[PDB]
Each structure stands twice: as structure tokens, then as C-alpha cells.
């Protein structure tokens with residue numbers, strides 16, 4: 001209830017929300033049905049349109065007009081955005097040549113360049129190039145300011161999760177908006193797109209930009225707009241606020257357009273009906289920039305043109321139905337569409353079993369257009385598991401397809417031709433970023449980046465300290481002329497030990513055997529040099545990784561590789577080696593197939609043992625540095641040290657062996673040498689962060705050997721591939737993966753075929769940023785390069801997506 005007896009006279013689009021039952025006059029009062037009786041009359045005026053006509057100049061001021069063309073409108077700050085063009089002979093902003101904005105050019109009393117965020121729903125990235133002919137204003141912003149060819153959304157590529165990620169810099173799993181529709185079991189409450197539960201603040205985690213501004217003394221205009229307020233009225237309201245006195249005028253503003261998403265759903269991303277929505281958006285941008293020019297703010301305000309997600313061709317006939325796979329279709333609740341989330345319908349049914357649900361959905365039809373996962377097995381780059389609102393069972397739907405429970409739900413519950421929500425590396429889901437203003441760079445193209453990084457930049461643009469978020473602050477410094485936050489490398493917490501030869505062979509009782517007794521002071525001294533690190537510059541190209549947590553580990557040097565061996569986890573945290581383009585792949589000799597050798601540098605108590613692997617009928621072992629890439633037969637014995645061994649399921653050894661025997665050499669051939677850092681990851685609570693020792697849920701049977709949940713590799717080479725990886729002078733090139741360490745290959749429907757048909761596809765799906773691996777390991781990479789730290793931060797956020 002609201003007693004709407006107050007008036008909006010002199011209160012239109014007020015910046016403070018008043019307390020009930022007093023009626024409201026702010027730009028959101030419609031969505032709460034709380035506007036004063038005269039809000040439409042006084043605030044949402046429409047008479048005479050939104051533009052000045054030639055016969056309106058100098059007119060007598062009439063307050064009933066939506067905007068004014070009188071002589072006093074500049075003083076009142078309420079001219080139509082084209083007033084100066086029509087009445088005072090000015091040019092439109094799009095028609096001016098663009099001149100570099102070297103310094104802010106602001107009117108007296110502007111403490112900082114304002115920031116205006118022009119956000120567009122469903123603005124697929126390829127629109128910038130394909131619609132450029134009909135978007136002149138947007139094309140000027142893109143070409144004269146700073147732009148990326150595309151910006152990567154977060155998963156799910158849905159509207160609420162991506163808009164709130166932009167506002168907070170957080171993964172949806174962290175800010176709590178994990179979909180457009182959610183059920184929180186702890187609340188026992190449902191979050192709906194259409195409804196009023198979505199207004200309870202308990203759903204919204206993190207600290208969004210408008211709260212960060214407010215808490216730090218930077219005034220924010222109200223970012224949000226009731227759908228019935230026309231776009232022209234939104235722009236006029238923003239320009240009016242920009243005419244407020246200095247003490248009252250906000251420094252950050254937001255405009256939002258429901259287009260082109262609204263039409264894209266009906267007509268498909270490139271339907272011929274999509275041209276006019278693109279024209280309309282551009283005209284709105286033109287009205288804003290014309291209005292800024294009138295206020296002498298067009299070389300003062302920083303403008304961000306940004307989307308939330310793209311749009312894909314999706315039709316009714318391309319739907320998969322769970323009733324075609326399950327018998328107990330009525331026992332499950334499904335969140336349908338471009339993703340699937342499954343949970344039990346009733347808690348009082350213990351005859352519900354997720355394992356049988358997953359099995360019935362796994363590789364059951366040859367053309368199957370979705371893949372089931374337990375959420376902890378989803379690719380780690382999606383960062384979509386660590387929230388109670390994310391159901392245990394997830395369906396990753398192929399692009400251009402939908403998943404639904406029963407056919408009933410589609411025809412009675414085709415209309416649409418477009419949709420979004422798919423995996424965030426899918427091209428059709430990519431969206432746009434353009435920055436224009438004094439603080440952005442001039443005519444600068446930046447590489448594609450993720451929308452989680454924008455929050456830090458928007459705080460930089462406003463002089464705000466960002467709340468803790470998942471961006472990497474400084475990785476977007478190359479977007480900015482000034483205001484850059486200058487990051488510093490984190491300090492190493494644990495320094496390593498450098499053990500020498502301290503143990504005799506007979507001190508070990510590991511149950512391991514090796515046929516290695518076949519055995520020159522020139523070459524005896526030569527291999528001692530290798531154990532002391534004489535070849536470390538060759539295999540450790542960017543310095544040792546820094547351990548950012550308290551632990552006990554040893555640096556181990558070898559002819560072909562270098563490792564940081566954890567005495568807590570009884571295995572390397574990282575193994576580093578360089579494979580040149582000329583390097584040759586050998587085989588494991590027949591007599592060294594089961595060879596495992598004690599490391600006389602590491603005590604028996606801090607070593608694995610072969611007996612555990614013999615007894616554990618589920619667990620085999622593999623090696624981090626591959627024996628196949630040994631530089632010599634004598635060096636190959638190094639690769640069989642017990643300190644190079646890691647536990648691996650036989651099913652995963654298929655994946656790992658093909659990567660080590662075939663793919664590393666192929667990458668070295670293609671990239672002119674590669675440097676590889678590989679190691680284990682433990683994330684049993686799927687929070688994306690390094691597990692401590694007491695969080696490990698699985699050990700090699702009868703031992704204290706922890707079982708990794710994942711294995712990573714970071715594959716670095718020279719960006720200029722005419723230079724070898726080990727002699728690179730300039731920027732680096734990286735691709736990484738975080739392979740799930742699973743006892744089966746059910747994820748790969750073609751896994752019964754040869755590894756050359758499925759392993760690399762699996763690895764592409766689990767591509768990762770170096771930053772993702774740092775979170776999961778507590779390690780800091782690229783400590784010692786000749787490149788600037790900000791550039792290294794950009795390299796660490798890079799994701800190799802394998803799209804075309």
C-alpha cells in the first residue's frame with residue numbers, strides 16, 4: 001500500500017527515494033506502483049515530440065512541452081537535444097571530425113570527468129561491424145575512442161547475471177544472481193524475472209558500483225528506469241541532472257536499452273527486422289552526444305558503450321526433451337532453456353538419485369545437443385558451482401538449441417527466433433565494449449577481455465577504490481590514458497629449500513623398482529651441474545613461481561625440467577620445462593616401463609611410494625615432466641623419480657599420455673618451441689581456490705598421498721613466433737587448461753575411439769586463464785620477465801577460446 005496524496009511538482013526524477021506511504025517521483029516509482037498522482041502529468045510530458053523544428057526557435061516557453069526550444073532552455077538545462085543544431089546553426093556531434101581529447105575540458109565546478117554508462121541488452125558483438133552502416137554515432141564512438149573487437153560475458157550468458165556482474169566485478173556464483181530464475185533452499189524462496197520477490201535485497205551479494213560510489217562520496221544518478229519511461233525521456237533526465245548545482249549533481253550515470261535484445265528474441269540475431277532497432281539505439285546515442293555538446297560536456301564526460309551478452313539463432317524445433325531420456329520425468333524440477341538445472345521435485349523423496357539421472361542423460365543419442373554435468377565437473381573457466389542456488393546437476397546446451405522437460409512445456413506454457421544463455425566462449429554470445437572520453441585512449445583497439453574486469457575500470461574512472469572482486473586490477477590499464485591503478489607484484493610467502501644429496505638408496509622402503517643400474521669425470525661433473533641448476537635458465541623462463549601461502553617445499557633441478565616439490569602434498573606444486581621446435585619425441589624403453597626411482601634429495605617420509613598404487617586398484621600414476629620428451633637416455637631416468645610422480649586414474653592417463661606424447665611436440669612445432677608448467681590442483685569444495693590440507697576428500701588408498709581434482713598446464717611461447725620460446729625479446733603468448741581428474745571419460749562421448757579423435761576436444765573445452773590456475777594453486781607466475789607488470793596481468797587474464 002501507498003498513500004499517493006503528495007505531489008511531484010518540482011520533484012520530477014528526484015535523486016533520493018522517499019519513505020512510504022508518501023508517494024515517489026523517482027525514475028523507478030512505476031515499477032513499485034508508487035508514483036504520485038501527477039507523475040505522468042508533470043514528469044512524463046510528451047507534447048510536441050523530442051526534437052526542435054525550425055519554426056520552434058525562440059518560442060515562448062510552454063511548460064507542457066516534453067523539451068523546449070525557447071531562448072532560456074540552455075539556462076534551465078532542458079533544451080531538446082537538437083536545439084543548437086536547428087536553432088543556433090550548430091552541427092551534430094556525429095558530423096564533427098573527432099579530435100583527440102588529451103585533457104578533460106570541463107565547465108567550472110566539475111571536480112572530475114563524469115562517467116555515463118550506456119548499456120545495451122543483447123547487443124551481439126558482430127553488430128558493430130555488420131550494422132556499422134546504420135549506426136553512425138556508435139561507429140564514431142568506436143573508431144575514435146577505445147574499443148575491443150568483443151567483450152566476453154559471464155556464464156550463464158543471461159541478462160540479470162551479466163548486468164550484475166558488470167555492476168560488481170563478481171562471478172555470478174559470488175554475487176548470487178546465478179540465473180534469471182533461482183531457488184534458494186536456505187531461504188526457501190524463489191527468485192523470478194517477473195515478480196516482486198526479486199526486490200528483496202538478500203538475493204544481491206557483493207557491492208555494486210552505485211553503492212561503491214555512494215559510500216566514497218561520489219554521487220550517483222539513479223541507474224534504473226521503469227520500462228514505460230521512453231528512451232528520449234531517459235536521456236533528457238540525464239542531461240537535466242548534469243545541469244544540477246555542483247553540490248547536488250551526480251558524477252556517474254547509467255542509461256539502459258532493452259533493445260536490441262527485445263527484437264532479437266522475436267526475429268533472430270540478424271533478422272531483417274533487426275536493422276531498425278540498431279538505428280534507434282544509434283539515434284539515442286546521437287541525442288546523448290548532442291546533448292552533451294550543448295552543455296559543453298562532450299570533451300569532458302567519459303562514455304562507456306557496453307552490452308551484457310549476445311544473441312543466437314534458436315527456434316522451437318531445436319529443443320531436446322528430458323522426457324525422451326528419463327522415465328521419472330515427473331520427479332525432477334527443470335530450469336529450462338539455453339541451460340539446464342535439475343533438482344528433486346520433493347525433498348521427502350530419498351528414492352531420487354542424481355547419479356542415475358546423469359547416467360540416463362549421458363551420450364544417449366548420437367546427435368545429442370546437451371551434455372550433463374555435476375556442477376563441480378563443469379569447466380573451471382565458467383566459475384559456476386559455488387552457490388547453493390546452483391543445482392548440483394547442470395546441462396550445458398549446444399548453441400542454437402534449447403532443453404525442456406516435456407513437449408507440453410513448449411507448445412502450451414513458434415514465437416521466438418533468438419536466445420542467449422549458452423557457454424560464454426560461444427561467439428554469438430560475445431558482446432561489445434567501447435570507451436570514449438578524456439580518460440580513455442584515442443583511436444585504440446584493445447584485445448578482447450572479460451566483463452568481470454570493467455568494475456575496476458569504472459572505479460578507476462571515478463577515483464573509487466573497488467570492493468573486492470574477481471577482476472585483476474591493472475589488467476585493463478592499457479584502455480586508459482591516465483588514472484591507471486599501478487599494481488605491484490604480491491610478495492612471496494614461502495621461500496623454498498634447495499636440498500642436496502642427503503639420503504642413501506637403502507633408506508627408502510617405497511616398494512619401487514627400476515632397472516637403472518647401468519653405469520667419466522667429464523660427464524659425471526656435467527650431471528652434477530644439472531642437479532645444481534646449470535640448465536635452469538633454459539627450462540624456467542619467467543622465474544620460479546612464487547608461493548603465496550605458508551608451506552614447505554623444495555626446488556628440484558634436473559637436466560630437462562625443474563620443479564617445486566611440496567613436502568605437504570608429496571608431489572610437485574609445479575613442474576617447468578621447455579620443449580624447443582627441434583626437440584624429438586622418444587618412447588619409454590621396454591625395460592623402464594614400471595621404473596620408479598627414489599629421489600636421494602627428499603626423505604622417505606616426504607615421498608610417495610609404489611605400494612599404495614599397487615594396492616589402490618582404482619588409482620594409477622603418471623608423471624608431470626613426460627619421459628617421452630627426455631633429451632637423452634641418461635636424462636630419461638630423471639623423469640622416473642618418485643618426486644615427478646602424481647596420482648592418475650587410468651582413464652585420465654589416456655588423456656594425459658596423449659597430451660604429453662603428441663600435443664606438446666605439436667605445440668612446440670607450431671609455436672617455435674613452448675615452455676610448459678604443469679601441476680596438480682585440489683579444489684574439492686569447488687570454490688575456485690586452492691584447498692588446504694584438511695579439505696582433501698580423497699587419498700591414494702592407504703596413504704597420505706592426496707588425489708588432485710584437476711591437472712593444469714600453462715603453455716607459453718613467443719608472440720612473435722619467428723623467435724624461439726627460450727629466446728623471446730617481446731610479448732608472450734599463452735594458452736592453458738585445467739583438466740578435470742576424473743575416473744572415467746564419460747564427458748567424451750567418442751572416448752572409445754583413438755585419443756586423436758577426442759582428447760584435444762576435451763582440452764579445448766577446459767581451456768583456462770593463467771589467473772584461474774593462480775586462484776586454484778596459490779602460485780604467482782611470470783615473476784621475472786622483461787615485460788611491464790600490467791602487460792603480464794593482461795597475459796594472465798587471457799583465455800584461448802578456439803573459436804573461429
Ligand SMILES: *[C@@H]1O[C@H](CO)[C@@H](O[C@@H]2O[C@H](CO)[C@@H](O[C@H]3O[C@H](CO[C@H]4O[C@H](CO)[C@@H](O)[C@H](O[C@H]5O[C@H](CO)[C@@H](O)[C@H](O)[C@@H]5O[C@H]5O[C@H](CO)[C@@H](O)[C@H](O)[C@@H]5O)[C@@H]4O)[C@@H](O)[C@H](O[C@H]4O[C@H](CO)[C@@H](O)[C@H](O)[C@@H]4O[C@H]4O[C@H](CO)[C@@H](O)[C@H](O)[C@@H]4O)[C@@H]3O)[C@H](O)[C@H]2NC(C)=O)[C@H](O)[C@H]1NC(C)=O
Pocket residue numbers: 170171173174175176202203204205206383386387388468469470687688689775
Ligand atoms: C571472487 O571474488 C570474491 C570477492 O572477493 C571472492 O569471494 C570471497 O571469498 C572469501 C573466501 O571464500 C570470503 O571471505 C569470508 O567470507 C565469510 C563471510 O563473509 C561475509 O562478509 C562479506 C563481506 O561483506 C559478504 O560479501 C559475504 O556474503 C556472502 O554470503 C551472502 C549470503 O550468505 C551472499 O549474499 C554473498 O554474495 C556472499 O556469498 C558468496 O560467498 C560466500 C562466502 O562468504 C559463499 O559461501 C556463497 O556460496 C557465495 O558464493 C559474507 O556475508 C567469512 O565468515 C569467512 O571466514 C571463514 O573462513 C576464514 C578463513 O580464514 C576463517 O578465518 C573463519 O574461521 C571463517 O570460518 C567460519 O566458517 C566455517 C565454515 O562456515 C566454520 O567451520 C568456522 O567455525 C567459522 O565459524 C571468509 O573469511 C568472502 O566473503 C567472499 N566474498 C564474496 C563477495 O563472495 C571469491 O573467492 C573470488 N573467486 C575467485 C574464483 O577468485
Ligand SMILES: CC(C)(C)c1ccc(/C=C2\SC(N3CCCC3)=NC2=O)cc1
Pocket residue numbers: 159160163164167198199200201204205206207208211224
Ligand atoms: C539486473 C540489474 C538491473 C543490474 C539490477 C536489478 C535489481 C537490483 C536490485 C538490488 S541490488 C541491492 N543491493 C546491492 C547490495 C546491497 C543491496 N538491492 C536490490 O534490491 C540490482 C540490479
Ligand SMILES: CC(C)(C)c1ccc(/C=C2\SC(N3CCCC3)=NC2=O)cc1
Pocket residue numbers: 117119159163164166167209223224225226254255256
Ligand atoms: C552497466 C550497469 C552500470 C551495471 C547498469 C546500468 C543500468 C542498468 C539499468 C537497467 S537494467 C533493466 N532491466 C534489465 C531487465 C529488464 C529491465 N532496467 C534498467 O533500467 C543496468 C546495469
Ligand SMILES: [Ca+2]
Pocket residue numbers: 682683684685686687688689690691692
Ligand atoms: Ca577450494
Ligand SMILES: [Cl-]
Pocket residue numbers: 158179180181335
Ligand atoms: Cl535461467
Ligand SMILES: [Zn+2]
Pocket residue numbers: 122159261262265420
Ligand atoms: Zn534476452
